[PDB]
Amino acid sequence: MNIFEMLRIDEGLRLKIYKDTEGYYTIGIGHLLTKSPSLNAAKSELDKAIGRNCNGVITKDEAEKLFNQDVDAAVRGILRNAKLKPVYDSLDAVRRCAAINQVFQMGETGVAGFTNSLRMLQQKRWDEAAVNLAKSRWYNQTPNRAKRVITTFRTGTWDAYK
Ligand SMILES: OCCOc1ccccc1
Numbered sequence: 741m742n743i744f745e746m747l748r749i750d751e752g753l754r755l756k757i758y759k760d761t762e763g764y765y766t767i768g769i770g771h772l773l774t775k776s777p778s779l780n781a782a783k784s785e786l787d788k789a790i791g792r793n794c795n796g797v798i799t800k801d802e803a804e805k806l807f808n809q810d811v812d813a814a815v816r817g818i819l820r821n822a823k824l825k826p827v828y829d830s831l832d833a834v835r836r837c838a839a840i841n842q843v844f845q846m847g848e849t850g851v852a853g854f855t856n857s858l859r860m861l862q863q864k865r866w867d868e869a870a871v872n873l874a875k876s877r878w879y880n881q882t883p884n885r886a887k888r889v890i891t892t893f894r895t896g897t898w899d900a901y902k
Pocket residue numbers: 818824825827828839840842843851854857858861873
């Protein structure tokens with residue numbers, strides 16, 4: 741297991757434009773296109789992302805290209821965030837994956853605001869952090885995934901991803 745295999749499980753792979761769990765146009769391995777309800781706006785974002793006229797459809801190679809960019813961008817975002825960087829750097833590699841997973845799904849600005857969870861994670865109070873992480877919209881809206889990510893934060897193992 742690694743961050744790519746983890747997010748591949750959590751996000752799936754679809755080659756045609758679809759709506760994510762929040763109802764937003766997405767493609768590939770959880771590549772959010774736009775929050776616009778206009779399919780044409782999503783198609784424009786897709787074509788811009790891929791660099792050709794896609795007509796709402798991409799290849800597996802293209803999906804994987806966006807995925808690598810998105811994972812990279814998530815990590816670099818964490819590293820430039822003054823609240824997230826020290827916590828991220830305090831973690832072991834497996835728990836870092838859980839952190840990347842959350843940021844990939846929820847975005848950096850929101851996650852940087854989870855002040856109490858962040859503190860518990862930096863303190864390595866794992867069971868407390870796990871309890872705190874579940875007290876969230878995130879957990880309520882995507883509980884199966886959140887349980888996996890939380891187990892990863894709690895244990896520093898890949899037990900939830902087998
Ligand atoms: O909800 C707690 C998120 O924990 C993180 C820790 C480090 C970087 C990003 C997230």
